[PDB]
Paper text:
An analysis of RC crystal structures obtained by lipid mesophase crystallization revealed non-native ligands that displaced the native electron-transfer cofactors (carotenoid sphero­idene and a ubi­quinone molecule) from their binding pockets. These ligands were identified and were found to be lipids that are major mesophase components. In the carotenoid-binding region an electron density is present that resembles a carotenoid molecule. However, the size and shape of this electron density do not allow the fitting of a full-sized sphero­idene molecule into it. In this position, the M162Phe side group occupies space that in the previously described RC structures is occupied by a sphero­idene molecule.
In this work crystallization techniques were selected, tested and optimized for the lipid mesophase crystallization of the Rhodobacter sphaeroides membrane pigment-protein complex, known as the photosynthetic reaction center (RC). In this work, the photosynthetic reaction center of the purple bacteria Rhodobacter (Rba.) sphaeroides was crystallized using various crystallization techniques. This transmembrane pigment-protein complex consists of three subunits L, M and H, and ten electron-transfer cofactors, including bacterio­chloro­phylls, bacteriopheophytins, ubi­quinones, non-heme iron ions and carotenoid sphero­idene. It should be noted that the RC of Rba. sphaeroides is one of the most well studied membrane complexes. The Rba. sphaeroides RC is a prospective object for structural and functional studies of photosynthesis.
Numbering used by the authors:
A (entry chain M): 1 to 302
B (entry chain L): 1 to 270
C (entry chain H): 9 to 248
The structure:
C-alpha cells in the first residue's frame, strides 16, 4: 500500500512531555500517566498529566454525585438485585416530578425529588467544568474559543433541562435520566409538537450536524493529503504559509471554485459545529412556549 | 483568475482520461475529462428536474418533487412521469457524483497530494447509493428510495422511521448517531483549539502546538496530537456515514419488525 | 415577521449571511487579490472585499506577520505561459523537480527552523535529541532505502523527530558518496527488511535538496525537500 498516514509506522519517545508552564499553577498538575503504544498508532502515546484545581475537584465530585444519585435510583428500581440491575440498566429511568408538582422543589424523593437532586449535581458539574475550560486556556495565555464553543452545547442542555421546563411551568417537561427513556422522551417531544422536521431551527441544526461531518471529512482528509508537506503543523503554516497550505487551498479552489486558508478553515469549522447546538437550542426553546405545532406553523408561513 | 501563489502549480499532467485534451481550467475550476462528464450528467439531471417541474405544474422549488416509481413497478423501468424521471435523474446523479470524485483524483495527481479526499467523498456516495440503489434492490422496489424534493424527502424519513417503531433502538443507528455527535464535538474542539493558539490572549505572542497539547492534557489528561485529530476527524465522520448505511442496509431487508424488540436479546435472558 | 418564531428564523438567516460573508473574507487573507496569469490583478475579484490586515506576533523574537499584505513568490518560477487565452497549463522551462514547479513546488518559507514552545529547534536528529529513541514498530535505522526502480539508494543513519510532539518526521539517509538526505516520513513505507519510497527512483535521492546544518533543518529546507519528493510521483513516473 502507498502509505496513507492513518497509522503511525514508527513510534518515538523521549523524556515525557510535561507541557508548557506559562501561568499554570503547577501544584494542581498530576504526574505523567502510562504511555500507551496502542494509542500511539493513531495519536500520541503519552497519558497525562492532568490539571485538577479547586474547580476540577468541585466538578468531579458534583459529577460523581450526579452519577451516584442516578446509580442508587437504578439500584432501587432493580430491587437491589445485581442481576436485574445489569439486565435492565438501559431501561431504568430517573424521571422528573409529575406536572402537578409544578416548578416546586417539594416533590417527594421517589417521584421527582431525586431527579431534582441529580439535576442540581449535574448543573454544578457542568458549569464548573465550563469555568475550567476557560481557566485552562487563560492559564496558558490562549484564546477562549473552547469555553465559547462549549457554551453552545451548554445552551442546548440548559434549554432542554432547565430553561424550557421553567418557561413551561413544570419540571415534568425536562429530560429523564435514562438511556432508553430519554430516547423515548425525544420521540414523544417531536410528536406532541407537530413533527420536529418542520421546526426550521431543527432543519438548520441538522444541516450543520451533517455539515460538520462533511467539513471534518473534507478537512481531515485534506490535512492527511498534505501531511507529506508538514500540513498538520497548522500553526506554523499560518505564520509562514508553505506548499502544504497552498496545495490544500488549490485542491479546493480547482474542485469547487473557492478555498480556505490554514487559519480560516478553523473558523468555518468552529462555526459549523457551534451552530448545531445554537440553532438546536433555539428550536427547542420555541417549542411549547411559542409554537405548539411546527407543521401547522410551517403551513401558514411562506 | 489565479491566487497569488497559484501559477507555479498549473502545469500539464495528472489526467486519468484524455491526456491533455481536457487539461485546462475555466476560471478557478479545473476541467479534465470528468469535469466534462460532471457537467453533462449535472446539466441533464437538472433539465429533467426542470421538466418534471413543468409536469408537476409548479416553479416553487419548495414544492417541486421528483418521486420514484410506485412500489408495484418493482425493480423495473417506469414511464417518465411515474418514476421514470426519478430513475434517469438518479442515473445522472450517480454519474455526476462519481465523475466529481474522479475529477478530484486528477486534481490530487496534478498537485502531488494524497487521495484521502475523493476516498472520503466515496463514503458519502455509497450512503446515497445505499438509499437509492442497494436498499431498494434488496427490498425489490425502486419506490423504497427517497423522493427528490426539499420537504418530501423528510416525509420519507419520518414515514420510513415510524414504520419500524422508534429507529432510536436500531443499534447501528445508535452507533452512527454517536459518531455524528462525537464528530461535531471534535470539530468544535479542533477548530477552537487551533484558533485559541493562533489568536491567543491580547498582549501575547502566537502559541505553539505545545500549548495545544498542554491545554488538552490539562483539561482531560490526554492530547491526541496534531496528526491524530485530523485522523480522528476523518475516522469519526466516515464511521458516522458507514454505520448510517449499515443501519439502513439492515432495515427492511434483514430486519422487518419494530426496532425496540431487537434489544430483548438482553432483557429476556433466562 | 409574524410571531416570535418567524422573527427569530428571519433574524437567524440574516445573521448566517453576515457570518458567511465574514468567514469568506477571513479566508482571503492569503493569496488575494486574484491575479491574471501575467501577475497583474484581475478585474473581477468577486463580491467579497479583501479583509483588513491582522497581525500575528511570532514567538521567540521571530517578528510579526501581517495578512493580507504584499505577496511575492520570493523565488524565480521556471514556467512559461503557453496560450494568449487564460486557463491553459504553463510549461516548465527546465527540470521541474530541480526548479520546484508543478507538484515539485516549494514555498520560499523562512530559512529558519521551526521552534518549540521553549524556543529550541522543533525537529532534531535523534543523535542530538536529549533522550530520544524508538518505542514501537520496525526500527528503520540501519535498513536499506529502496526506490520505485527497486534499487537501493542508501541506508537510514538516523531519524529526525518532532521533539515537543514526539513523532517521526524524516529519515536521514546516507548516499553512496557518504552524504545524507532527509526523506519525509509520510512518503516512505517501513517494512520488515527495507524502507520503500515509491515517489523517487534510486538515482533521484541525490537530487533531494541539502541542508546547511547536520542537526537542524529550516522551514525553507523542509519545503524544498518535501516538494521535490512529492514531485517524483509525476516527474519520476517514466521510471516507476
Ligand atoms: C442524510 C439522510 C437522509 C436525509 C435527511 C435529512 C433531514 C432529516 C434533513 C435534511 C436536510 C436537508 N437535506 Mg436531506 N437527507 C438525505 C439526502 C439528501 C441529499 C442526497 C443527494 O443524498 C441531498 C442533496 C439532501 C439535501 C438536503 C438539504 C435540502 C437540507 C440541508 C442539508 C445539508 O446542509 O447537509 C450538509 C451539507 C452542506 C452544509 C453542504 C451544502 C448542501 C446543499 C445546501 C444541498 C442542496 C441540495 C439542493 C437543494 C438539491 C440539488 C440541487 C440541484 C441544483 C437540483 N439530502 C437522506 C435521504 N436531510 C434538512 C432540511 O432542512 O431539509 C429541508 C433536514 O432537516
Ligand atoms: C423521533 C425523533 C424526532 C427528533 C427529535 C429531536 C429532539 C426532541 C431534539 C432533536 C435534536 C437534534 N436532532 Mg432531531 N429528531 C428526529 C429526527 C432527526 C434526524 C433524522 C435523519 O431522522 C436527525 C439527523 C436529527 C438530528 C438532530 C440534531 C441536529 C439535534 C441535536 C444536536 C446535538 O448535538 O445534540 C447533542 C448535544 C447535546 C444534547 C448537548 C449536550 C451538552 C451537555 C453539557 C453535555 C454534558 C455531558 C454530561 C456531563 C456527561 C458526562 C460524561 C463524561 C464522559 C464524564 N434529528 C425526529 C423528528 N431531535 C435537538 C435539537 O436541537 O432540536 C432542535 C433536540 O433537542
Ligand atoms: C439531541 C436530542 C436528545 C438526545 C438524543 C439522542 C439520540 C437519538 C441518541 C443519543 C445517544 C446518546 N446520548 Mg442523548 N440526546 C439528548 C441529550 C443527552 C444528554 C444531555 C446532557 O442532555 C446526554 C448526557 C446524552 C447522552 C447520550 C449517550 C448515552 C449517547 C451518546 C451521545 C454522544 O455521542 O455524545 C458525544 C460525547 C462523547 C462521545 C464523549 C462523552 C461520552 C459519554 C458516553 C456521554 C454519556 C454519559 C452517560 C450519562 C453515561 C452512561 C453510562 C452507562 C449507562 C453505564 N444525551 C437530547 C435530549 N441521544 C445515542 C445512543 O446510543 O443512545 C443509546 C443515540 O442514538
Ligand atoms: C422520524 C425519523 C426517525 C429516524 C429515521 C431514519 C431514517 C429512515 C434514516 C435515518 C438516517 C440517519 N439518522 Mg435517524 N431517525 C430518527 C432520529 C434520529 C436522530 C435524533 C436526534 O433523534 C438522529 C441524530 C438521527 C441520525 C441519523 C443519521 C445516523 C442518519 C442520517 C445521516 C446519513 O445517513 O448521512 C449519509 C449522507 C448522505 C445520504 C448524503 C449524500 C450526499 C451525496 C453523496 C452528494 C450530494 C451532492 C448534492 C446533490 C450537490 C448539490 C449542489 C451543491 C450543493 C452545489 N436520527 C427518528 C427516530 N434515520 C438515514 C440513514 O442512515 O441513511 C443512510 C436514513 O435513511
Ligand atoms: C458544538 C456542539 C457540540 C459540543 C461541544 C463541546 N462539548 C464540550 C466542549 C465543546 C466545545 C468542551 O469544551 C467540553 C470538553 O471538555 O470537551 C473535552 C465538552 C464536553 N461535552 C461532553 C459531552 C457531550 N457533548 C455532547 C455534544 C456536543 N458537544 C455537541 C455535538 C454530547 C451529546 C449527547 O451529544 C455529550 C454527552 C463532555 C465529555 C464535556 C464536558 C464535561 C463535563 O461537563 O463534565 C461534567 C463532569 C463530570 C465529572 C461528569 C460526571 C462523571 C461521569 C458521569 C463518571 C461516570 C463513570 C465512572 C464513575 C468512572 C470512574 C471509575 C473508574 C475509573 C475506576
Ligand atoms: C462521508 C462524510 C460526509 C461527506 C463527505 C464529503 N462530501 C463531499 C466530499 C467529502 C469528503 C467532497 O470532496 C465533495 C465536495 O466537493 O465537497 C465540497 C462532497 C460534496 N458533498 C456534497 C453534499 C452533501 N454532502 C453530505 C454529506 C456528507 N459528505 C457526509 C456526512 C450531504 C448531506 C445531506 O448530509 C450533502 C448535501 C456536495 C457539496 C459535494 C458534492 C458535489 C458534487 O457532487 O457536485 C457534482 C454534482 C452536482 C453539481 C449536481 C448534480 C445534480 C443531480 C444530477 C440532480 C440532483 C439530484 C439529487 C439526488 C437531488 C436531491 C434533492 C434533495 C432535496 C434531497
Ligand atoms: C487546510 O486546507 C483546507 C483548505 O484550504 C486551505 C480548504 O480550502 C478547504 C475547503 C473548505 C472550505 C473552503 C470551507 C467552506 C466549505 C463548506 C462550508 C462545505 C460546503 C461547500 C459548499 C456548499 C460549496 C459547494 C460548491 C460546489 C460543490 C461546486 C459549485 C459548482 C459550480 C458553481 C460549478 C460546478 C463545476 C463543475 C460542474 C466542474 C466542471 C467545470 C466546467 C467548467 C465544465 C479545506 C477543507 C481544507 O482543509
Ligand atoms: C453501581 C452504581 C453506579 C450507577 C451506574 C449507572 C449510571 C448510568 C447513568 C445514566 C444516565 C442516563 C444519561 C442519558 C440521558 C441523559 C440526558 C440528560 O442529562 O437530560 C438533561 C436533563 O433534563 C437536564 O440535566
Ligand atoms: C469529564 C469529561 C471526560 C472527557 C474524556 C475525553 C473526551 C472526548 C470527547 C471528544 C473527543 C474529541 C477529543 C479530541 C479533540 C481535540 C481537538 C484538538 O485539536 O486536539 C488535537 C491535539 O490534542 C492538539 O494538537
Ligand atoms: C481519554 C481521556 C482520559 C485520560 C485521563 C488520564 C490522566 C492520566 C493521569 C495519571 C496520573 C499519574 N499520577 C498517578 C502519577 O499522578
Ligand atoms: C480511535 C482510536 C483508534 C486507535 C486504535 C489503533 C489500532 C491499532 C492499529 C495498529 C497498526 C498496525 N500497523 C502494522 C499498521 O502498524
Ligand atoms: C457555516 C457554514 C454555512 C452552512 C449553511 C447551511 C445552510 C443549510 C440550509 C438548510 C435550510 C433549513 N430550513 C429549515 C431553513 O429549510
Ligand atoms: C443550494 C445552496 C447551495 C449553495 C452553495 C454553492 C456555492 C457556490 C459558490 C462557488 C463560487 C464559484 N465562483 C465562480 C464564484 O468562484
Ligand atoms: C421564547 C420564550 C418566550 C416564552 C413565552 C412564555 C411561555 C409561557 C407559556 C405560553 C403558552 C404559549 N402558547 C399559548 C402559544 O402555547
Ligand atoms: C444508477 C442507479 C440506478 C437507478 C435507476 C435505474 C433504473 C433504469 C430505468 C430506465 C428508465 C426507463 N425509462 C427510460 C423508460 O424511463
Ligand atoms: C453553504 C455554505 C457555503 C457558502 C459558500 C460561499 C461561497 C464563497 C465564494 C467565494 C468567491 C471565490 N472568489 C471569487 C472570491 O475567489
Ligand atoms: Fe486542522
Amino acid at each position: 500500500a502507498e502509505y496513507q498516514n492513518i497509522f503511525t509506522q514508527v513510534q518515538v519517545r523521549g523524556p515525557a512531555d510535561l507541557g508548557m508552564t506559562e501561568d499554570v499553577n503547577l501544584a494542581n498538575r498530576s504526574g505523567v500517566g502510562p504511555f500507551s503504544t496502542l494509542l500511539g498508532w493513531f495519536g500520541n502515546a503519552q497519558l497525562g498529566p492532568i490539571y485538577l484545581g479547586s474547580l476540577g475537584v468541585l466538578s468531579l465530585f458534583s459529577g460523581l454525585m450526579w452519577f451516584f444519585t442516578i446509580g442508587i435510583w437504578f439500584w432501587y428500581q432493580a430491587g437491589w438485585n445485581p442481576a436485574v440491575f445489569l439486565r435492565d440498566l438501559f431501561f431504568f429511568s430517573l424521571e422528573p416530578p409529575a406536572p402537578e408538582y409544578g416548578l416546586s422543589f417539594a416533590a417527594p424523593l421517589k417521584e421527582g425529588g431525586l431527579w431534582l437532586i441529580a439535576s442540581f449535581f449535574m448543573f454544578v458539574a457542568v458549569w464548573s467544568w465550563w469555568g475550567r475550560t476557560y481557566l485552562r486556556a487563560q492559564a496558558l495565555g490562549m484564546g477562549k474559543h473552547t469555553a465559547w464553543a462549549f457554551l453552545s452545547a451548554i445552551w442546548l442542555w440548559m434549554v432542554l433541562g432547565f430553561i424550557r421546563p421553567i418557561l413551561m411551568g413544570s419540571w415534568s417537561e425536562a429530560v429523564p435520566y435514562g438511556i432508553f427513556s430519554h430516547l423515548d422522551w425525544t420521540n414523544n417531544f417531536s410528536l406532541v409538537h407537530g413533527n420536529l422536521f418542520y421546526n426550521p431551527f431543527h432543519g438548520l441544526s441538522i444541516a450543520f450536524l451533517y455539515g460538520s461531518a462533511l467539513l471534518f471529512a473534507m478537512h481531515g482528509a485534506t490535512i492527511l493529503a498534505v501531511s507529506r508537506f508538514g500540513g498538520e503543523r497548522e500553526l506554523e503554516q499560518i505564520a509562514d504559509r508553505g506548499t502544504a497550505a497552498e496545495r490544500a487551498a488549490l485542491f479546493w479552489r480547482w474542485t469547487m471554485g473557492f478555498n480556505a486558508t490554514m487559519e480560516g478553515i478553523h473558523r468555518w469549522a468552529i462555526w459549523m459545529a457551534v451552530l448545531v447546538t445554537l440553532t438546536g437550542g433555539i428550536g427547542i426553546l420555541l417549542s411549547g412556549t411559542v409554537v405548539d405545532n411546527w407543521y401547522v406553523w410551517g403551513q401558514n408561513h411562506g | 483568475a489565479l491566487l497569488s501563489f497559484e501559477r507555479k502549480y498549473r502545469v500539464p499532467g495528472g489526467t486519468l482520461v484524455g491526456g491533455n485534451l481536457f487539461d485546462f481550467w475555466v476560471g478557478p475550476f479545473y476541467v479534465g475529462f470528468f469535469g466534462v462528464a460532471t457537467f453533462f450528467f449535472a446539466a441533464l439531471g437538472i433539465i429533467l428536474i426542470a421538466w418534471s417541474a413543468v409536469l408537476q405544474g409548479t416553479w416553487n422549488p419548495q414544492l417541486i418533487s421528483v418521486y420514484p416509481p410506485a412500489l408495484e413497478y418493482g425493480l423495473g423501468g417506469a414511464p417518465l412521469a411515474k418514476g421514470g424521471l426519478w430513475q434517469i435523474i438518479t442515473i445522472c446523479a450517480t454519474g455526476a457524483f462519481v465523475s466529481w470524485a474522479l475529477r478530484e483524483v486528477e486534481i490530487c495527481r496534478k498537485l502531488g497530494i494524497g487521495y484521502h479526499i475523493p476516498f472520503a467523498f466515496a463514503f458519502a456516495i455509497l450512503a446515497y447509493l445505499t438509499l437509492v440503489l442497494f436498499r431498494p434492490v434488496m427490498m425489490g422496489a425502486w419506490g423504497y428510495a427517497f423522493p427528490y424534493g426539499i420537504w418530501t424527502h423528510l416525509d420519507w424519513v419520518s414515514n420510513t422511521g415510524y414504520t419500524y417503531g422508534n429507529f432510536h433502538y436500531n443499534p447501528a443507528h445508535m452507533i452512527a448517531i454517536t459518531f455524528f455527535f462525537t464528530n461535531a464535538l471534535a470539530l468544535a474542539l479542533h477548530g477552537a483549539l487551533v484558533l485559541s493558539a493562533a489568536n491567543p490572549e491580547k498582549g501575547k505572542e502566537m502559541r505553539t502546538p505545545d500549548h495545544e497539547d498542554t491545554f488538552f492534557r490539562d483539561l482531560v489528561g490526554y492530547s491526541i496530537g496534531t496528526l491524530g485529530i485530523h485522523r480522528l476527524g476523518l475516522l469519526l465522520s466516515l464511521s458516522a456515514v458507514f454505520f448510517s448505511a449499515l443501519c439502513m442496509i439492515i432495515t427492511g431487508t434483514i430486519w422487518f419488525d419494530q426496532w425496540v424488540d431487537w434489544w430483548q436479546w438482553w432483557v429476556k435472558l433466562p | 415577521n409574524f410571531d416570535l418564531a418567524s422573527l427569530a428564523i428571519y433574524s437567524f438567516w440574516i445573521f448566517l449571511a453576515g457570518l458567511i460573508y465574514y468567514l469568506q473574507t477571513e479566508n482571503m487573507r492569503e493569496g488575494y487579490p486574484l491575479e491574471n496569469e501575467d501577475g497583474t490583478p484581475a478585474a473581477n475579484q468577486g463580491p467579497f472585499p479583501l479583509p483588513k490586515p491582522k497581525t500575528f506576533i511570532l514567538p521567540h523574537g521571530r517578528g510579526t506577520l501581517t495578512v493580507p499584505g504584499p505577496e511575492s513568490e520570493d523565488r524565480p518560477i521556471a514556467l512559461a505561459r503557453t496560450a494568449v487565452s487564460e486557463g491553459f497549463p504553463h510549461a516548465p522551462t527546465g527540470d521541474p523537480m530541480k526548479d520546484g514547479v508543478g507538484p515539485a513546488s516549494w514555498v520560499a518559507r523562512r530559512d529558519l527552523p521551526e521552534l518549540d514552545g521553549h524556543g529550541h529547534n522543533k525537529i532534531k536528529p535523534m543523535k542530538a535529541a536529549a533522550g530520544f529513541h524508538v518505542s514501537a514498530g520496525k526500527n528503520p535505522i540501519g535498513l536499506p532505502v529502496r526506490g520505485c526502480d527497486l534499487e537501493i539508494a542508501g541506508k537510514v543513519v538516523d531519524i529526525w523527530v518532532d521533539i515537543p510532539e514526539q513523532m517521526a518526521r524524516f529519515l536521514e539517509v546516507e548516499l553512496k558518496d557518504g552524504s545524507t538526505r532527509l526523506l519525509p516520513m509520510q512518503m516512505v513505507k517501513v517494512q520488515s527488511n527495507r524502507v520503500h519510497v515509491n515517489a523517487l527512483s534510486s538515482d533521484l535521492f541525490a537530487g533531494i535538496p541539502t541542508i546547511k546544518s547536520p542537526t537542524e533543518v529550516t522551514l525553507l529546507e523542509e519545503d524544498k525537500i518535501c516538494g521535490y519528493v512529492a514531485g517524483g510521483l509525476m516527474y519520476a513516473a517514466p521510471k516507476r
